[PDB]
PDB file of N, CA and C and ligand atoms in Angstrom:
ATOM      1  N   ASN A  42     -30.630  94.062 210.030  1.00 20.94           N
ATOM      2  CA  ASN A  42     -30.094  93.191 208.984  1.00 20.94           C
ATOM      3  C   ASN A  42     -31.143  92.144 208.631  1.00 20.94           C
ATOM      4  N   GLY A  43     -31.884  92.382 207.553  1.00 21.27           N
ATOM      5  CA  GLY A  43     -32.946  91.480 207.171  1.00 21.27           C
ATOM      6  C   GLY A  43     -34.200  91.608 207.998  1.00 21.27           C
ATOM      7  N   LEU A  44     -34.285  92.624 208.847  1.00 20.26           N
ATOM      8  CA  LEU A  44     -35.411  92.824 209.749  1.00 20.26           C
ATOM      9  C   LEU A  44     -36.156  94.074 209.305  1.00 20.26           C
ATOM     10  N   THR A  45     -37.292  93.886 208.651  1.00 18.64           N
ATOM     11  CA  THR A  45     -38.100  94.997 208.188  1.00 18.64           C
ATOM     12  C   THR A  45     -39.279  95.202 209.129  1.00 18.64           C
ATOM     13  N   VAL A  46     -40.042  96.259 208.876  1.00 18.53           N
ATOM     14  CA  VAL A  46     -41.284  96.531 209.587  1.00 18.53           C
ATOM     15  C   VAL A  46     -42.340  96.894 208.557  1.00 18.53           C
ATOM     16  N   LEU A  47     -43.429  96.203 208.580  1.00 19.22           N
ATOM     17  CA  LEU A  47     -44.428  96.528 207.581  1.00 19.22           C
ATOM     18  C   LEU A  47     -45.475  97.471 208.159  1.00 19.22           C
ATOM     19  N   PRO A  48     -46.006  98.386 207.357  1.00 20.26           N
ATOM     20  CA  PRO A  48     -46.994  99.327 207.866  1.00 20.26           C
ATOM     21  C   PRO A  48     -48.365  98.683 207.934  1.00 20.26           C
ATOM     22  N   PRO A  49     -49.241  99.169 208.808  1.00 21.92           N
ATOM     23  CA  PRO A  49     -50.594  98.617 208.874  1.00 21.92           C
ATOM     24  C   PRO A  49     -51.390  98.963 207.628  1.00 21.92           C
ATOM     25  N   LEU A  50     -52.442  98.180 207.395  1.00 23.06           N
ATOM     26  CA  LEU A  50     -53.278  98.408 206.222  1.00 23.06           C
ATOM     27  C   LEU A  50     -54.183  99.620 206.402  1.00 23.06           C
ATOM     28  N   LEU A  51     -54.657  99.864 207.617  1.00 19.59           N
ATOM     29  CA  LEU A  51     -55.536 100.990 207.908  1.00 19.59           C
ATOM     30  C   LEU A  51     -54.741 102.074 208.623  1.00 19.59           C
ATOM     31  N   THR A  52     -54.743 103.280 208.067  1.00 20.60           N
ATOM     32  CA  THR A  52     -54.046 104.393 208.688  1.00 20.60           C
ATOM     33  C   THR A  52     -54.860 104.935 209.860  1.00 20.60           C
ATOM     34  N   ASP A  53     -54.292 105.912 210.566  1.00 21.29           N
ATOM     35  CA  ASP A  53     -55.012 106.535 211.671  1.00 21.29           C
ATOM     36  C   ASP A  53     -56.182 107.371 211.175  1.00 21.29           C
ATOM     37  N   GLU A  54     -56.042 107.979 209.999  1.00 21.42           N
ATOM     38  CA  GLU A  54     -57.083 108.847 209.471  1.00 21.42           C
ATOM     39  C   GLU A  54     -58.339 108.081 209.079  1.00 21.42           C
ATOM     40  N   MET A  55     -58.261 106.757 208.963  1.00 22.43           N
ATOM     41  CA  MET A  55     -59.429 105.929 208.684  1.00 22.43           C
ATOM     42  C   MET A  55     -60.060 105.395 209.961  1.00 22.43           C
ATOM     43  N   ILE A  56     -59.226 105.025 210.930  1.00 22.74           N
ATOM     44  CA  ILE A  56     -59.733 104.617 212.232  1.00 22.74           C
ATOM     45  C   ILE A  56     -60.489 105.767 212.880  1.00 22.74           C
ATOM     46  N   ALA A  57     -60.013 106.996 212.673  1.00 21.35           N
ATOM     47  CA  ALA A  57     -60.747 108.151 213.174  1.00 21.35           C
ATOM     48  C   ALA A  57     -62.122 108.256 212.529  1.00 21.35           C
ATOM     49  N   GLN A  58     -62.219 107.976 211.228  1.00 21.26           N
ATOM     50  CA  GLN A  58     -63.519 108.032 210.567  1.00 21.26           C
ATOM     51  C   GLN A  58     -64.469 106.967 211.103  1.00 21.26           C
ATOM     52  N   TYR A  59     -63.980 105.744 211.321  1.00 19.48           N
ATOM     53  CA  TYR A  59     -64.828 104.735 211.960  1.00 19.48           C
ATOM     54  C   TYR A  59     -65.309 105.186 213.333  1.00 19.48           C
ATOM     55  N   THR A  60     -64.406 105.732 214.148  1.00 17.90           N
ATOM     56  CA  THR A  60     -64.808 106.171 215.480  1.00 17.90           C
ATOM     57  C   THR A  60     -65.865 107.268 215.404  1.00 17.90           C
ATOM     58  N   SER A  61     -65.672 108.237 214.510  1.00 15.58           N
ATOM     59  CA  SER A  61     -66.645 109.311 214.363  1.00 15.58           C
ATOM     60  C   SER A  61     -67.988 108.780 213.887  1.00 15.58           C
ATOM     61  N   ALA A  62     -67.978 107.812 212.970  1.00 16.25           N
ATOM     62  CA  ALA A  62     -69.232 107.225 212.508  1.00 16.25           C
ATOM     63  C   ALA A  62     -69.962 106.526 213.644  1.00 16.25           C
ATOM     64  N   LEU A  63     -69.231 105.781 214.472  1.00 18.80           N
ATOM     65  CA  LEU A  63     -69.859 105.123 215.613  1.00 18.80           C
ATOM     66  C   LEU A  63     -70.501 106.143 216.545  1.00 18.80           C
ATOM     67  N   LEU A  64     -69.777 107.223 216.849  1.00 19.73           N
ATOM     68  CA  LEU A  64     -70.323 108.252 217.733  1.00 19.73           C
ATOM     69  C   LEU A  64     -71.571 108.892 217.139  1.00 19.73           C
ATOM     70  N   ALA A  65     -71.517 109.256 215.858  1.00 21.48           N
ATOM     71  CA  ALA A  65     -72.654 109.913 215.231  1.00 21.48           C
ATOM     72  C   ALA A  65     -73.846 108.986 215.086  1.00 21.48           C
ATOM     73  N   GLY A  66     -73.618 107.674 215.046  1.00 24.24           N
ATOM     74  CA  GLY A  66     -74.734 106.751 215.027  1.00 24.24           C
ATOM     75  C   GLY A  66     -75.325 106.491 216.392  1.00 24.24           C
ATOM     76  N   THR A  67     -74.509 106.563 217.444  1.00 26.28           N
ATOM     77  CA  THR A  67     -75.015 106.332 218.790  1.00 26.28           C
ATOM     78  C   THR A  67     -75.517 107.598 219.468  1.00 26.28           C
ATOM     79  N   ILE A  68     -75.344 108.764 218.855  1.00 28.23           N
ATOM     80  CA  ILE A  68     -75.887 109.993 219.429  1.00 28.23           C
ATOM     81  C   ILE A  68     -77.283 110.284 218.899  1.00 28.23           C
ATOM     82  N   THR A  69     -77.485 110.162 217.592  1.00 22.94           N
ATOM     83  CA  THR A  69     -78.729 110.564 216.953  1.00 22.94           C
ATOM     84  C   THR A  69     -79.700 109.414 216.725  1.00 22.94           C
ATOM     85  N   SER A  70     -79.352 108.193 217.123  1.00 24.85           N
ATOM     86  CA  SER A  70     -80.229 107.059 216.867  1.00 24.85           C
ATOM     87  C   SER A  70     -80.408 106.117 218.042  1.00 24.85           C
ATOM     88  N   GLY A  71     -79.647 106.259 219.120  1.00 25.47           N
ATOM     89  CA  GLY A  71     -79.743 105.285 220.188  1.00 25.47           C
ATOM     90  C   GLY A  71     -79.047 103.997 219.805  1.00 25.47           C
ATOM     91  N   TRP A  72     -79.657 102.877 220.176  1.00 26.70           N
ATOM     92  CA  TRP A  72     -79.106 101.567 219.873  1.00 26.70           C
ATOM     93  C   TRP A  72     -79.701 100.949 218.620  1.00 26.70           C
ATOM     94  N   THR A  73     -80.585 101.660 217.925  1.00 22.56           N
ATOM     95  CA  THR A  73     -81.327 101.050 216.834  1.00 22.56           C
ATOM     96  C   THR A  73     -80.475 100.819 215.596  1.00 22.56           C
ATOM     97  N   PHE A  74     -79.364 101.530 215.446  1.00 24.69           N
ATOM     98  CA  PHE A  74     -78.567 101.370 214.240  1.00 24.69           C
ATOM     99  C   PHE A  74     -77.698 100.126 214.272  1.00 24.69           C
ATOM    100  N   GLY A  75     -77.629  99.429 215.402  1.00 20.09           N
ATOM    101  CA  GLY A  75     -76.901  98.181 215.479  1.00 20.09           C
ATOM    102  C   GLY A  75     -77.688  96.951 215.099  1.00 20.09           C
ATOM    103  N   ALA A  76     -78.981  97.101 214.816  1.00 21.46           N
ATOM    104  CA  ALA A  76     -79.846  95.977 214.494  1.00 21.46           C
ATOM    105  C   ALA A  76     -80.555  96.124 213.157  1.00 21.46           C
ATOM    106  N   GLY A  77     -80.315  97.206 212.425  1.00 23.14           N
ATOM    107  CA  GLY A  77     -80.977  97.442 211.164  1.00 23.14           C
ATOM    108  C   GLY A  77     -80.830  98.879 210.715  1.00 23.14           C
ATOM    109  N   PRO A  78     -81.862  99.419 210.073  1.00 22.07           N
ATOM    110  CA  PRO A  78     -81.825 100.830 209.681  1.00 22.07           C
ATOM    111  C   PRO A  78     -81.811 101.741 210.896  1.00 22.07           C
ATOM    112  N   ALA A  79     -81.106 102.861 210.761  1.00 22.84           N
ATOM    113  CA  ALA A  79     -80.988 103.819 211.849  1.00 22.84           C
ATOM    114  C   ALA A  79     -82.205 104.731 211.877  1.00 22.84           C
ATOM    115  N   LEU A  80     -82.763 104.935 213.067  1.00 20.83           N
ATOM    116  CA  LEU A  80     -83.976 105.715 213.248  1.00 20.83           C
ATOM    117  C   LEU A  80     -83.711 106.879 214.194  1.00 20.83           C
ATOM    118  N   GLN A  81     -84.377 108.003 213.944  1.00 19.01           N
ATOM    119  CA  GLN A  81     -84.154 109.190 214.754  1.00 19.01           C
ATOM    120  C   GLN A  81     -84.815 109.051 216.118  1.00 19.01           C
ATOM    121  N   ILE A  82     -84.276 109.786 217.085  1.00 20.67           N
ATOM    122  CA  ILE A  82     -84.885 109.951 218.403  1.00 20.67           C
ATOM    123  C   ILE A  82     -84.175 111.104 219.106  1.00 20.67           C
ATOM    124  N   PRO A  83     -84.899 112.028 219.729  1.00 17.85           N
ATOM    125  CA  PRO A  83     -84.234 113.104 220.469  1.00 17.85           C
ATOM    126  C   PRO A  83     -83.499 112.566 221.683  1.00 17.85           C
ATOM    127  N   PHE A  84     -82.398 113.229 222.026  1.00 19.46           N
ATOM    128  CA  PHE A  84     -81.513 112.697 223.063  1.00 19.46           C
ATOM    129  C   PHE A  84     -82.170 112.599 224.435  1.00 19.46           C
ATOM    130  N   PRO A  85     -82.857 113.622 224.952  1.00 20.91           N
ATOM    131  CA  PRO A  85     -83.552 113.436 226.234  1.00 20.91           C
ATOM    132  C   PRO A  85     -84.638 112.386 226.172  1.00 20.91           C
ATOM    133  N   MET A  86     -85.002 111.922 224.979  1.00 20.87           N
ATOM    134  CA  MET A  86     -85.938 110.815 224.869  1.00 20.87           C
ATOM    135  C   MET A  86     -85.219 109.476 224.815  1.00 20.87           C
ATOM    136  N   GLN A  87     -83.961 109.461 224.373  1.00 22.13           N
ATOM    137  CA  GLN A  87     -83.143 108.259 224.497  1.00 22.13           C
ATOM    138  C   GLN A  87     -82.765 108.002 225.947  1.00 22.13           C
ATOM    139  N   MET A  88     -82.324 109.047 226.644  1.00 21.69           N
ATOM    140  CA  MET A  88     -81.898 108.860 228.021  1.00 21.69           C
ATOM    141  C   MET A  88     -83.045 108.399 228.906  1.00 21.69           C
ATOM    142  N   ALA A  89     -84.287 108.719 228.542  1.00 20.95           N
ATOM    143  CA  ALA A  89     -85.428 108.234 229.309  1.00 20.95           C
ATOM    144  C   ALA A  89     -85.509 106.717 229.273  1.00 20.95           C
ATOM    145  N   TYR A  90     -85.348 106.122 228.091  1.00 23.74           N
ATOM    146  CA  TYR A  90     -85.342 104.666 227.999  1.00 23.74           C
ATOM    147  C   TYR A  90     -84.109 104.069 228.653  1.00 23.74           C
ATOM    148  N   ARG A  91     -82.979 104.769 228.600  1.00 25.37           N
ATOM    149  CA  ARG A  91     -81.794 104.223 229.255  1.00 25.37           C
ATOM    150  C   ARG A  91     -81.933 104.226 230.777  1.00 25.37           C
TER     151      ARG A  91
ATOM    152  N   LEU B 255     -13.358 113.440 219.527  1.00 27.65           N
ATOM    153  CA  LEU B 255     -12.193 113.911 220.248  1.00 27.65           C
ATOM    154  C   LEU B 255     -10.940 113.509 219.474  1.00 27.65           C
ATOM    155  N   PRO B 256      -9.833 114.212 219.667  1.00 30.22           N
ATOM    156  CA  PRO B 256      -8.692 114.038 218.759  1.00 30.22           C
ATOM    157  C   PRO B 256      -7.937 112.729 218.935  1.00 30.22           C
ATOM    158  N   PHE B 257      -8.518 111.754 219.633  1.00 28.87           N
ATOM    159  CA  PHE B 257      -7.867 110.458 219.747  1.00 28.87           C
ATOM    160  C   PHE B 257      -8.770 109.264 219.464  1.00 28.87           C
ATOM    161  N   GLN B 258     -10.073 109.453 219.248  1.00 31.15           N
ATOM    162  CA  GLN B 258     -10.871 108.314 218.820  1.00 31.15           C
ATOM    163  C   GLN B 258     -10.653 108.035 217.338  1.00 31.15           C
ATOM    164  N   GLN B 259     -10.983 106.811 216.935  1.00 32.37           N
ATOM    165  CA  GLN B 259     -10.949 106.419 215.533  1.00 32.37           C
ATOM    166  C   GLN B 259     -12.336 106.091 214.993  1.00 32.37           C
ATOM    167  N   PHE B 260     -13.042 105.149 215.610  1.00 33.10           N
ATOM    168  CA  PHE B 260     -14.285 104.642 215.054  1.00 33.10           C
ATOM    169  C   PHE B 260     -15.482 105.354 215.675  1.00 33.10           C
ATOM    170  N   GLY B 261     -16.676 104.862 215.354  1.00 37.11           N
ATOM    171  CA  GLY B 261     -17.883 105.279 216.031  1.00 37.11           C
ATOM    172  C   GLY B 261     -18.826 104.099 216.134  1.00 37.11           C
ATOM    173  N   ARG B 262     -19.707 104.158 217.128  1.00 37.83           N
ATOM    174  CA  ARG B 262     -20.603 103.041 217.389  1.00 37.83           C
ATOM    175  C   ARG B 262     -21.906 103.563 217.967  1.00 37.83           C
ATOM    176  N   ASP B 263     -22.955 102.765 217.813  1.00 34.46           N
ATOM    177  CA  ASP B 263     -24.294 103.130 218.236  1.00 34.46           C
ATOM    178  C   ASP B 263     -24.710 102.286 219.435  1.00 34.46           C
ATOM    179  N   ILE B 264     -25.973 102.434 219.838  1.00 34.99           N
ATOM    180  CA  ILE B 264     -26.475 101.767 221.030  1.00 34.99           C
ATOM    181  C   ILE B 264     -26.398 100.251 220.915  1.00 34.99           C
ATOM    182  N   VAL B 265     -26.432  99.710 219.695  1.00 34.34           N
ATOM    183  CA  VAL B 265     -26.388  98.268 219.494  1.00 34.34           C
ATOM    184  C   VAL B 265     -25.011  97.799 219.028  1.00 34.34           C
ATOM    185  N   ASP B 266     -24.005  98.677 219.075  1.00 37.21           N
ATOM    186  CA  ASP B 266     -22.613  98.333 218.771  1.00 37.21           C
ATOM    187  C   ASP B 266     -22.431  97.934 217.306  1.00 37.21           C
ATOM    188  N   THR B 267     -22.899  98.796 216.410  1.00 40.17           N
ATOM    189  CA  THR B 267     -22.619  98.699 214.987  1.00 40.17           C
ATOM    190  C   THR B 267     -21.879  99.955 214.558  1.00 40.17           C
ATOM    191  N   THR B 268     -20.845  99.785 213.738  1.00 42.42           N
ATOM    192  CA  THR B 268     -20.051 100.927 213.307  1.00 42.42           C
ATOM    193  C   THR B 268     -20.902 101.867 212.465  1.00 42.42           C
ATOM    194  N   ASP B 269     -20.882 103.156 212.808  1.00 42.68           N
ATOM    195  CA  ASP B 269     -21.688 104.115 212.064  1.00 42.68           C
ATOM    196  C   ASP B 269     -20.951 105.426 211.807  1.00 42.68           C
ATOM    197  N   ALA B 270     -19.631 105.454 211.978  1.00 40.55           N
ATOM    198  CA  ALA B 270     -18.823 106.615 211.631  1.00 40.55           C
ATOM    199  C   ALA B 270     -17.359 106.221 211.697  1.00 40.55           C
ATOM    200  N   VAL B 271     -16.589 106.629 210.689  1.00 44.34           N
ATOM    201  CA  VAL B 271     -15.156 106.369 210.644  1.00 44.34           C
ATOM    202  C   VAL B 271     -14.450 107.664 210.268  1.00 44.34           C
ATOM    203  N   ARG B 272     -13.203 107.797 210.711  1.00 44.13           N
ATOM    204  CA  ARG B 272     -12.376 108.951 210.393  1.00 44.13           C
ATOM    205  C   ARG B 272     -11.297 108.558 209.393  1.00 44.13           C
ATOM    206  N   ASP B 273     -11.118 109.391 208.372  1.00 46.85           N
ATOM    207  CA  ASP B 273     -10.187 109.098 207.285  1.00 46.85           C
ATOM    208  C   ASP B 273      -8.747 109.275 207.758  1.00 46.85           C
ATOM    209  N   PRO B 274      -7.876 108.283 207.551  1.00 43.55           N
ATOM    210  CA  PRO B 274      -6.481 108.411 207.999  1.00 43.55           C
ATOM    211  C   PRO B 274      -5.693 109.504 207.290  1.00 43.55           C
ATOM    212  N   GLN B 275      -5.756 109.554 205.958  1.00 44.91           N
ATOM    213  CA  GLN B 275      -4.982 110.528 205.195  1.00 44.91           C
ATOM    214  C   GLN B 275      -5.333 111.949 205.607  1.00 44.91           C
ATOM    215  N   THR B 276      -6.568 112.359 205.351  1.00 44.57           N
ATOM    216  CA  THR B 276      -7.076 113.646 205.796  1.00 44.57           C
ATOM    217  C   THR B 276      -7.954 113.405 207.014  1.00 44.57           C
ATOM    218  N   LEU B 277      -7.614 114.044 208.130  1.00 46.75           N
ATOM    219  CA  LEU B 277      -8.306 113.746 209.374  1.00 46.75           C
ATOM    220  C   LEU B 277      -9.724 114.291 209.320  1.00 46.75           C
ATOM    221  N   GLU B 278     -10.658 113.456 208.874  1.00 46.44           N
ATOM    222  CA  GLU B 278     -12.054 113.842 208.755  1.00 46.44           C
ATOM    223  C   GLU B 278     -12.919 112.604 208.927  1.00 46.44           C
ATOM    224  N   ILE B 279     -14.094 112.802 209.514  1.00 47.30           N
ATOM    225  CA  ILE B 279     -14.975 111.713 209.906  1.00 47.30           C
ATOM    226  C   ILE B 279     -16.004 111.497 208.807  1.00 47.30           C
ATOM    227  N   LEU B 280     -16.110 110.259 208.330  1.00 46.74           N
ATOM    228  CA  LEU B 280     -17.037 109.892 207.266  1.00 46.74           C
ATOM    229  C   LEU B 280     -18.152 109.035 207.845  1.00 46.74           C
ATOM    230  N   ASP B 281     -19.392 109.487 207.681  1.00 48.04           N
ATOM    231  CA  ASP B 281     -20.546 108.710 208.109  1.00 48.04           C
ATOM    232  C   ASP B 281     -20.798 107.570 207.134  1.00 48.04           C
ATOM    233  N   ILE B 282     -21.248 106.436 207.661  1.00 46.08           N
ATOM    234  CA  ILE B 282     -21.466 105.229 206.875  1.00 46.08           C
ATOM    235  C   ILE B 282     -22.916 104.788 207.016  1.00 46.08           C
ATOM    236  N   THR B 283     -23.521 104.406 205.889  1.00 45.78           N
ATOM    237  CA  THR B 283     -24.905 103.967 205.825  1.00 45.78           C
ATOM    238  C   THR B 283     -24.964 102.747 204.913  1.00 45.78           C
ATOM    239  N   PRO B 284     -25.603 101.662 205.339  1.00 51.73           N
ATOM    240  CA  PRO B 284     -25.621 100.447 204.521  1.00 51.73           C
ATOM    241  C   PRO B 284     -26.451 100.624 203.260  1.00 51.73           C
ATOM    242  N   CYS B 285     -26.140  99.799 202.265  1.00 52.40           N
ATOM    243  CA  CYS B 285     -26.853  99.848 201.000  1.00 52.40           C
ATOM    244  C   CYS B 285     -28.286  99.350 201.171  1.00 52.40           C
ATOM    245  N   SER B 286     -29.133  99.716 200.214  1.00 51.35           N
ATOM    246  CA  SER B 286     -30.565  99.486 200.336  1.00 51.35           C
ATOM    247  C   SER B 286     -30.917  98.014 200.154  1.00 51.35           C
ATOM    248  N   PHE B 287     -31.963  97.586 200.856  1.00 49.46           N
ATOM    249  CA  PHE B 287     -32.498  96.240 200.712  1.00 49.46           C
ATOM    250  C   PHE B 287     -33.951  96.257 201.162  1.00 49.46           C
ATOM    251  N   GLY B 288     -34.631  95.146 200.933  1.00 51.20           N
ATOM    252  CA  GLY B 288     -36.028  95.032 201.299  1.00 51.20           C
ATOM    253  C   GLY B 288     -36.676  93.863 200.599  1.00 51.20           C
ATOM    254  N   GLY B 289     -37.928  93.617 200.972  1.00 49.99           N
ATOM    255  CA  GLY B 289     -38.662  92.517 200.393  1.00 49.99           C
ATOM    256  C   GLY B 289     -39.232  92.849 199.031  1.00 49.99           C
ATOM    257  N   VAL B 290     -39.588  91.800 198.296  1.00 52.96           N
ATOM    258  CA  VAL B 290     -40.174  91.926 196.968  1.00 52.96           C
ATOM    259  C   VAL B 290     -41.455  91.108 196.936  1.00 52.96           C
ATOM    260  N   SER B 291     -42.547  91.728 196.498  1.00 48.87           N
ATOM    261  CA  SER B 291     -43.837  91.064 196.421  1.00 48.87           C
ATOM    262  C   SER B 291     -44.420  91.242 195.030  1.00 48.87           C
ATOM    263  N   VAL B 292     -45.130  90.219 194.564  1.00 49.10           N
ATOM    264  CA  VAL B 292     -45.707  90.193 193.227  1.00 49.10           C
ATOM    265  C   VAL B 292     -47.223  90.201 193.347  1.00 49.10           C
ATOM    266  N   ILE B 293     -47.866  91.120 192.636  1.00 48.25           N
ATOM    267  CA  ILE B 293     -49.319  91.216 192.590  1.00 48.25           C
ATOM    268  C   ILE B 293     -49.797  90.597 191.288  1.00 48.25           C
ATOM    269  N   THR B 294     -50.747  89.666 191.379  1.00 48.46           N
ATOM    270  CA  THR B 294     -51.229  89.009 190.180  1.00 48.46           C
ATOM    271  C   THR B 294     -52.707  88.675 190.288  1.00 48.46           C
ATOM    272  N   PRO B 295     -53.466  88.836 189.216  1.00 47.18           N
ATOM    273  CA  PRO B 295     -54.784  88.209 189.126  1.00 47.18           C
ATOM    274  C   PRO B 295     -54.605  86.722 188.847  1.00 47.18           C
ATOM    275  N   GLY B 296     -55.719  85.998 188.836  1.00 48.29           N
ATOM    276  CA  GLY B 296     -55.649  84.576 188.562  1.00 48.29           C
ATOM    277  C   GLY B 296     -55.156  84.301 187.155  1.00 48.29           C
ATOM    278  N   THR B 297     -54.407  83.206 187.007  1.00 46.08           N
ATOM    279  CA  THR B 297     -53.955  82.811 185.677  1.00 46.08           C
ATOM    280  C   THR B 297     -55.120  82.437 184.774  1.00 46.08           C
ATOM    281  N   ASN B 298     -56.275  82.107 185.354  1.00 45.29           N
ATOM    282  CA  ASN B 298     -57.486  81.934 184.565  1.00 45.29           C
ATOM    283  C   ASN B 298     -57.915  83.228 183.890  1.00 45.29           C
ATOM    284  N   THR B 299     -57.477  84.376 184.402  1.00 47.16           N
ATOM    285  CA  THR B 299     -57.889  85.669 183.870  1.00 47.16           C
ATOM    286  C   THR B 299     -56.842  86.267 182.937  1.00 47.16           C
ATOM    287  N   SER B 300     -55.622  86.471 183.425  1.00 45.23           N
ATOM    288  CA  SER B 300     -54.610  87.171 182.644  1.00 45.23           C
ATOM    289  C   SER B 300     -53.231  86.646 183.019  1.00 45.23           C
ATOM    290  N   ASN B 301     -52.197  87.319 182.508  1.00 46.22           N
ATOM    291  CA  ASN B 301     -50.813  87.012 182.841  1.00 46.22           C
ATOM    292  C   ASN B 301     -50.011  88.258 183.195  1.00 46.22           C
ATOM    293  N   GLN B 302     -50.657  89.413 183.316  1.00 48.11           N
ATOM    294  CA  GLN B 302     -49.958  90.609 183.753  1.00 48.11           C
ATOM    295  C   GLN B 302     -49.684  90.551 185.249  1.00 48.11           C
ATOM    296  N   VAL B 303     -48.587  91.186 185.664  1.00 49.70           N
ATOM    297  CA  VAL B 303     -48.194  91.238 187.064  1.00 49.70           C
ATOM    298  C   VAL B 303     -47.717  92.642 187.396  1.00 49.70           C
TER     299      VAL B 303
HETATM  300  C1  NAG C 240      -0.568 112.743 203.485  1.00 50.01           C
HETATM  301  O1  NAG C 240      -0.196 113.229 202.188  1.00 50.01           O
HETATM  302  C2  NAG C 240      -1.084 114.222 201.654  1.00 50.01           C
HETATM  303  C3  NAG C 240      -0.586 114.548 200.266  1.00 50.01           C
HETATM  304  O2  NAG C 240       0.458 115.511 200.309  1.00 50.01           O
HETATM  305  C4  NAG C 240      -1.116 115.438 202.574  1.00 50.01           C
HETATM  306  O3  NAG C 240      -2.055 116.384 202.076  1.00 50.01           O
HETATM  307  C5  NAG C 240      -1.504 115.018 203.984  1.00 50.01           C
HETATM  308  O4  NAG C 240      -1.423 116.136 204.859  1.00 50.01           O
HETATM  309  C6  NAG C 240      -0.584 113.905 204.484  1.00 50.01           C
HETATM  310  N1  NAG C 240      -1.003 113.454 205.801  1.00 50.01           N
HETATM  311  C7  NAG C 240      -0.700 114.102 206.929  1.00 50.01           C
HETATM  312  C8  NAG C 240      -1.215 113.490 208.197  1.00 50.01           C
HETATM  313  O5  NAG C 240      -0.043 115.138 206.927  1.00 50.01           O
END
């Protein structure tokens, strides 16, 4: 009675896209995409620095 | 069952009644309601809403 529920602004199908973008940026670029342009590096060469 | 009259839910609101004249159960649902919101650009720009 007078008690509604409002839906969120971002659906699940968009949060999934953000998560996938984060994964694809941290797999093929290392940590470099968090400070500027994203740069390539092979994965066994990223793990060496880690 | 052939001796109940009303119906009630987990929060104790009536949600089913049986008709006295013809013995049949009528489901009840409240009328629609909700909030109303107005979308507007600035009055410096337009007056459409
Ligand atoms: C009440 O009257 C109506 C009209 O004749 C009838 O159909 C109905 O069976 C009556 N109620 C009962 C409990 O018999």
